[PDB]
Amino acid sequence: TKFECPSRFGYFADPKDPHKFYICSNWEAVHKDCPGNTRWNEDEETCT
Amino acid sequence: TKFECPSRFGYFADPKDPHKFYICSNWEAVHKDCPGNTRWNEDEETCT
């Protein structure tokens, strides 16, 4: 992905899809899907 | 027994829960959750 990790490690929203998110480790992002019909919850750092 | 850091800095599996892990900084640990239904991936030091 061309998503740019804002930090070396962390979980970040996908600005293009509220049903997805990115997990960064050592500045490398992996695109993930929220389970079921859940959506990224910024303050919870998970899908709700 | 309280998790003991194996290294000064590092990311380590939680042997009790595949959804959790520990982050070590200056030999002190913080217990963390993986997001969504992801699970800790030791080899890649990330949630997968």
Side-chain angles (χ1 to χ4, degrees), chain A residues 20-31:
Chain A
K20 300 181 179 185
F21 61 100
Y22 291 95
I23 301 180
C24 293
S25 184
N26 203 28
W27 301 95
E28 300 291 331
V30 180
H31 211 176

Side-chain angles (χ1 to χ4, degrees), chain A residues 1 3-15 17-48:
Chain A
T1 62
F3 177 79
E4 291 275 356
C5 288
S7 301
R8 185 174 193 174
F9 187 85
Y11 323 140
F12 304 95
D14 180 351
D17 188 337
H19 304 269
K20 300 181 179 185
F21 61 100
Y22 291 95
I23 301 180
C24 293
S25 184
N26 203 28
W27 301 95
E28 300 291 331
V30 180
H31 211 176
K32 298 289 176 189
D33 292 313
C34 284
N37 302 313
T38 60
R39 294 183 182 209
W40 187 249
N41 185 322
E42 183 187 353
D43 293 340
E44 289 296 297
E45 308 185 311
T46 191
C47 304
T48 66

Side-chain angles (χ1 to χ4, degrees), chain B residues 1 3-15 17-27 29-48:
Chain B
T1 306
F3 186 80
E4 189 74 17
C5 284
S7 312
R8 180 179 182 212
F9 296 105
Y11 290 76
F12 304 94
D14 180 350
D17 190 334
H19 307 103
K20 299 186 180 182
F21 60 102
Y22 292 96
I23 306 176
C24 289
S25 181
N26 292 328
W27 300 99
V30 167
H31 204 185
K32 292 299 205 185
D33 298 296
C34 284
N37 290 341
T38 65
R39 283 178 180 214
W40 182 248
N41 174 347
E42 290 191 64
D43 284 349
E44 302 195 57
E45 291 192 350
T46 195
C47 297
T48 293

